Design a protein around this ligand. Structure first.
Ligand SMILES: [Mg+2]
Ligand SMILES: [Mg+2]
Ligand SMILES: [Mg+2]
Ligand SMILES: [Mg+2]
Ligand SMILES: [Mg+2]
Ligand SMILES: [Mg+2]
Ligand SMILES: [Mg+2]
Ligand SMILES: [Mg+2]
Ligand SMILES: [Mg+2]
Ligand SMILES: [Mg+2]
Ligand SMILES: [Mg+2]
Lengths: 205, 324, 32
RNA sequence: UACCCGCAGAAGAAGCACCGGCUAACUCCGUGCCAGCAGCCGCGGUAAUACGGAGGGUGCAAGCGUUAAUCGGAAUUACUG
């Protein structure tokens, strides 16, 4: 129910930086980011129509750290909902609690955020929420609980975030360690490198 | 060479846990006079004693010539120890004798045999294959100081030989050829097909040991045959020109056949109450000869065919012995 | 037993297809 | 009982299928039309990315494969068509 193994390998496979490591040290130093993993790494076969879509799907899943069934469910939900589908899916993904935490900057990585969520450190409207997959709604304040405020990891994460680009759809305070989820994110506010249409197509297939 | 010798000697050691324990058991229960009172028991002990006796005399060489070799053989072979290295030649001979003994001694193994060679599918090619097979066996006989008596030979029309039945007599003939019996496969580019694509033909080799008044008929065609009708298998002879001799020859072959029919059937029945493919292959393209059974491959086909490989036979014999 | 066994199919004559031969033409190769 | 609070210590907790094409994923060794594979096309006859083993990889994941059984693809009973 989680991906436990090598993180950078996944990134290599994808062809991108998936942000699977904290971002203290640049990914190019830690691994051969260009070369895909394995004995036949340098070789680059031309990828089929089916393949590309699949790859894209994997990338997205990898980014947020989500397994297939759950992803499928999310997709279905998105489809059910009104308006654009890919966008909806993206929003849903964002909405997850761990992801939100990561964005805020209490996790260095999304994995870290997830762990924090699990380990009963994250209060959502002053009630401890333990589930990573928990959707965070608009105007939901979300904080480190007072026992988990002393942890040196959290402050490090925050610092890291401060170097990183800040999201517009949240508002977060470093001293109080509580952030407010202001509105569900627009597509433009997320990264353009992901192609949600491909994912939609894949699921239609 | 030394390594080989060692390997050979290791086999001999292989029969040390058999000989001692068995011997002990025999003296403990069989040697006794109150056990002896039953004949069967006595017979059993005698059989058991036979095993012991074999192990006694021949193991000495293995032990005595091994232990005495190393002190004098180590550094010098050419000067002063030219006797001492070819002193181990004697040991080798002894080892060989032991091995051969182990291989043989089994039922009917001394009495000469009459192998029939039967071709397979392919038609024209196949007959040639049969002929080739026959030739190899003839050469083997020649090699091993035997005398071959050619009984049945029958030419195939387009080429080669259809049927043959060749009887050799001498020193432990059957033993050697008893393994061969079965299908021999000829995997080679036909000389008859213009395409020269690789083909596969076959040959059965029936090999049997040599060992009523109104239910047999004898018919002349100077030729002769002895048709034992109740079983229903015929034999036909054409070796000598004199008729009586030919008839006699036919009679022995037929008798052998009768025995063969009996014994195998009996064995089957007993088994009931209680190889798949080709045995050998010969792959001339590839210059390559796998015996599928016993996992040995000879890389000079020509040598094998010209004169049948004693070494291969020995291996086969060993396997057969093990199975027995 | 020897005789019938020979007659049975497992011991049928085998012939091989050709790669540069006459009946060579492979419509699709082993590998893409 | 749910739920909460405390205790210790990375501790007790990852497999299954697949990697010729369709179909995401490739190399070496063994075998030598055998042994085996296989949904279809078809692999294997001595350099097998198609068998078996390895290493590497891919996909699913407390499951993963196989079979059975239905609809779908099949506009291949076509009312739509
Ligand atoms: Mg689950
Ligand atoms: Mg939708
Ligand atoms: Mg592919
Ligand atoms: Mg398989
Ligand atoms: Mg080889
Ligand atoms: Mg190979
Ligand atoms: Mg080949
Ligand atoms: Mg394999
Ligand atoms: Mg089925
Ligand atoms: Mg229909
Ligand atoms: Mg159907």
């Amino acid at each position: 129910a989680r991906y436990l193994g090598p993180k950078l390998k996944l990134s290599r496979r994808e062809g991108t930086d998936l942000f699977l490591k904290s971002g203290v040290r640049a990914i190019d130093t830690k691994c051969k980011i260009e070369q895909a993993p394995g004995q036949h790494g340098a070789r680059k076969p031309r990828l089929s129509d089916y393949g590309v879509q699949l790859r894209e799907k994997q990338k997205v899943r990898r980014i947020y750290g989500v397994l297939e069934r759950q992803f499928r469910n999310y997709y279905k939900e998105a489809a059910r909902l009104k308006g654009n589908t890919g966008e909806n899916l993206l929003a849903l993904l964002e909405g997850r609690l761990d992801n939100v935490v990561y964005r805020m900057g209490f996790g260095a990585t999304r994995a870290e955020a997830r762990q924090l969520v699990s380990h009963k450190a994250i209060m959502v409207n002053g009630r401890v929420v333990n589930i990573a997959s928990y959707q965070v709604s608009p105007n939901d304040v979300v904080s480190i609980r007072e026992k988990a405020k002393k942890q040196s990891r959290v402050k490090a994460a925050l610092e890291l975030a401060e170097q990183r680009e800040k999201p517009t759809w949240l508002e977060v305070d470093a001293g109080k360690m509580e952030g407010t989820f202001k509105r569900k994110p627009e597509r433009s506010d997320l990264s353009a490198d992901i192609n949600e249409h491909l994912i939609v197509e894949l699921y239609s297939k | 060479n030394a390594s080989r010798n060692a390997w050979k000697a290791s086999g001999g050691i292989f029969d040390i846990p058999q000989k001692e324990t068995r011997l002990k058991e025999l003296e403990r229960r069989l040697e006794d006079p109150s056990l002896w009172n039953d004949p069967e028991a006595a017979r059993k002990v005698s059989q058991e004693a036979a095993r012991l006796r074999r192990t006694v005399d021949t193991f000495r060489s293995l032990e005595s010539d091994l232990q005495g070799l190393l002190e004098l053989m180590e550094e010098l072979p050419a000067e002063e120890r030219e006797a001492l290295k070819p002193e181990l030649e004697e040991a080798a001979k002894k080892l060989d004798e032991l091995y051969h003994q182990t291989l043989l001694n089994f039922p009917h193994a001394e009495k000469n045999a009459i192998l029939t060679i039967q071709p397979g599918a392919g038609g024209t090619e196949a007959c040639d294959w049969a002929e080739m097979l026959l030739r190899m066996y003839t050469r083997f006989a020649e090699r091993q100081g035997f005398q071959v008596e050619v009984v049945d030979l029958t030419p195939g029309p387009e080429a080669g030989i259809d049927y043959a039945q060749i009887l050799v007599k001498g020193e432990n003939a059957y033993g050697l050829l008893s393994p061969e019996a079965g299908v021999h496969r000829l995997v080679r580019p036909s000389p008859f097909d213009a395409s020269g694509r690789r083909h596969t033909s076959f040959a059965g080799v029936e090999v049997i040991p040599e060992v009523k008044p109104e239910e047999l008929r004898i018919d002349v065609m100077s030729a002769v045959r002895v048709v034992h009708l109740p079983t229903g298998i015929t034999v036909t002879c054409q070796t000598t020109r004199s008729q009586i001799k030919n008839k006699e020859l036919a009679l022995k072959i037929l008798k052998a056949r009768l025995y063969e029919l009996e014994r195998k059937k009996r064995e089957e029945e007993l088994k009931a109450l209680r190889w798949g493919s080709q045995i050998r292959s010969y792959v001339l393209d590839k210059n390559y000869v796998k015996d599928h059974r016993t996992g040995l491959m000879r890389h000079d086909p020509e040598n094998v065919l010209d004169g049948d490989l004693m070494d291969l036979i020995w291996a086969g014999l060993e396997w057969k012995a093990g199975r027995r | 037993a020897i005789e019938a066994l020979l007659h049975d199919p497992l011991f049928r004559q085998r012939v091989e297809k050709n790669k540069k031969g006459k009946g060579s033409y492979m419509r699709k190769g082993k590998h893409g």
